[PDB]
Amino acid sequence: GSPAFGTADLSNCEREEIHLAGSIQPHGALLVVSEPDHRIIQASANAAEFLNLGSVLGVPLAEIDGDLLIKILPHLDPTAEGMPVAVRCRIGNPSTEYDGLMHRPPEGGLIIELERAGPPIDLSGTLAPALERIRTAGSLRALCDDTALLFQQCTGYDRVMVYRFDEQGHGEVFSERHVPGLESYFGNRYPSSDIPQMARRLYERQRVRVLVDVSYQPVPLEPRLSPLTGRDLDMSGCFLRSMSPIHLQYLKNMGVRATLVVSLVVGGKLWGLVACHHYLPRFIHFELRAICELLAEAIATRITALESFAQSQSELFVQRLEQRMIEAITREGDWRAAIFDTSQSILQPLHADGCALVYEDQIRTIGDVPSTQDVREIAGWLDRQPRAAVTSTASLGLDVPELAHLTRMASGVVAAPISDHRGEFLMWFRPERVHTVTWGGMGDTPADLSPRRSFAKWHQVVEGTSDPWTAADLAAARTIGQTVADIVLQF
Numbered sequence: 001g002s003p004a005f006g007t008a009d010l011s012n013c014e015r016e017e018i019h020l021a022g023s024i025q026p027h028g029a030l031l032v033v034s035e036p037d038h039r040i041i042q043a044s045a046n047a048a049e050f051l052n053l054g055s056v057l058g059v060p061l062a063e064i065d066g067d068l069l070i071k072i073l074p075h076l077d078p079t080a081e082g083m084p085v086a087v088r089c090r091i092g093n094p095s096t097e098y099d100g101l102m103h104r105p106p107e108g109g110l111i112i113e114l115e116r117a118g119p120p121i122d123l124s125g126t127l128a129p130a131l132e133r134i135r136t137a138g139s140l141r142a143l144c145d146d147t148a149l150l151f152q153q154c155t156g157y158d159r160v161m162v163y164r165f166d167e168q169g170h171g172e173v174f175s176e177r178h179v180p181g182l183e184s185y186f187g188n189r190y191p192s193s194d195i196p197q198m199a200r201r202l203y204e205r206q207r208v209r210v211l212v213d214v215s216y217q218p219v220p221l222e223p224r225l226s227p228l229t230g231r232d233l234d235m236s237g238c239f240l241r242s243m244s245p246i247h248l249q250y251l252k253n254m255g256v257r258a259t260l261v262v263s264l265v266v267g268g269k270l271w272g273l274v275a276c277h278h279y280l281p282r283f284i285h286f287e288l289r290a291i292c293e294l295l296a297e298a299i300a301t302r303i304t305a306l307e308s309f310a311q312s313q314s315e316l317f318v319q320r321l322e323q324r325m326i327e328a329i330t331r332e333g334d335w336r337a338a339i340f341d342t343s344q345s346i347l348q349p350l351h352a353d354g355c356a357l358v359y360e361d362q363i364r365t366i367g368d369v370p371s372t373q374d375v376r377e378i379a380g381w382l383d384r385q386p387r388a389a390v391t392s393t394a395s396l397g398l399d400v401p402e403l404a405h406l407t408r409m410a411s412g413v414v415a416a417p418i419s420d421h422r423g424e425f426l427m428w429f430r431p432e433r434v435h436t437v438t439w440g441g442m443g444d445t446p447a448d449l450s451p452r453r454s455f456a457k458w459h460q461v462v463e464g465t466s467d468p469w470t471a472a473d474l475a476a477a478r479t480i481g482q483t484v485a486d487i488v489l490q491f
């Protein structure tokens with residue numbers, strides 16, 4: 001079934017227990033405390049040297065040099081806003097300050113992650129004109145480009161990419177900003193398997209993820225197995241959680257040495273990431289984490305506003321076309337001209353590269369459409385049996401093997417009937433998605449992991465396929481198809 005944390009290979013890593021890592025990155029320390037009463041019962045092995053403490057494991061938090069207990073207590077107030085929560089405390093014998101991050105896993109007590117504090121700095125001069133740029137963005141393109149720039153300006157990382165996941169989970173490098181001279185990944189695709197489902201749920205549970213040095217030596221928890229459960233400690237909510245050797249090897253092959261990844265979550269779904277990559281090990285100021293979180297919420301809000309604006313654009317193009325015909329039939333005794341271009345493109349309310357109208361044995365086409373004999377082959381298949389108000393597919397060959405030769409122009413077809421005579425259709429097209437990008441290639445083993453190979457593994461799945469048809473896509477064909485039909489019954 002599911003391989004334990006350090007132990008997967010390329011064939012079973014989907015199910016690797018990355019949330020049960022059993023270890024942390026060396027630049028912090030992790031205590032596990034029981035409740036109530038707050039006895040340290042599990043600790044990262046580096047805890048004593050890291051925190052300047054004699055012993056750790058088994059000693060009550062009250063008895064640890066320096067105010068940590070006192071600093072967590074106000075956040076266990078039933079009525080407080082509570083966990084996850086950050087605190088600043090002093091710990092240890094040569095006493096020093098730490099930023100603590102406390103949360104409660106569903107099982108195992110209280111987890112407290114510690115890192116060395118620096119002096120307090122105020123980053124709020126950053127989020128305000130950034131907030132204005134985000135809320136001001138005119139399009140998804142513009143917003144993601146500005147978000148790559150913005151994240152590069154406030155993080156200083158060598159490369160920032162904003163990925164965007166599609167219906168199936170696959171990633172597109174949708175925006176990129178990098179220091180001149182690096183190679184570009186802008187426009188690359190990767191298969192959804194490059195990011196395991198559990199990694200995806202982890203990006204929803206915490207919104208900032210940090211790797212300071214791709215070369216670190218994991219520091220194990222002791223005892224490892226939680227004494228309260230006899231099982232591995234749920235580490236979903238741990239900022240210091242080690243990172244899978246699989247992905248570390250991926251970064252090593254890419255040249256990359258550090259990583260600051262921020263989650264974009266839209267309507268409760270992981271929508272993409274803002275990935276910051278550095279070609280050097282890289283520490284960050286604690287106050288940079290809240291900045292990322294605030295920024296990613298603004299972005300996610302804007303994306304919602306854009307998708308929603310796009311929505312009513314469609315619903316407009318529609319009820320603003322019942323009229324492109326109403327009259328444009330008064331003089332010029334036929335409606336078709338309204339269908340085809342006129343810059344009210346029948347092609348974009350569905351994001352298609354081609355459209356055809358088959359009506360009374362007359363076939364007209366804009367964009368990239370199969371041969372007119374080929375439209376007829378499709379019309380012949382639509383008439384083979386009774387259909388829904390809309391019929392669609394994003395893998396025409398394979399769904400309909402005899403139509404395989406149409407993969408090029410028409411892996412994706414959506415058809416809507418326009419009467420009952422039938423043989424009469426409004427038909428939209430999309431090419432095999434391979435033709436929406438090109439570049440790629442190669443083989444398999446952790447040493448072979450790379451963007452190049454990922455772009456190739458992507459072309460391989462996806463093979464007999466177009467961009468999938470969305471709900472909105474189908475709603476549009478639905479309602480467009482309908483109002484044409486309504487108005488053909490007219491005359």
Ligand SMILES: */C=C/C1=C(C)C(=O)N/C1=C\C1=NC(=C\c2[nH]c(/C=C3/NC(=O)C(C=C)=C3C)c(C)c2CCC(=O)O)/C(CCC(=O)O)=C1C
Binds near residue numbers: 009
């Ligand atoms: C079977 C397991 C894995 C295979 C195979 C794999 O490629 N990755 C697997 C596990 C993990 N991936 C994690 C994060 C991650 N992986 C990549 C993959 C990309 N593919 C691309 O072509 C490129 C470059 C353009 C990349 C970066 C991406 C994009 C991500 C998101 C993180 C990032 O951008 O740095 C992952 C989680 C790591 C963690 O612990 O935070 C696991 C596990």
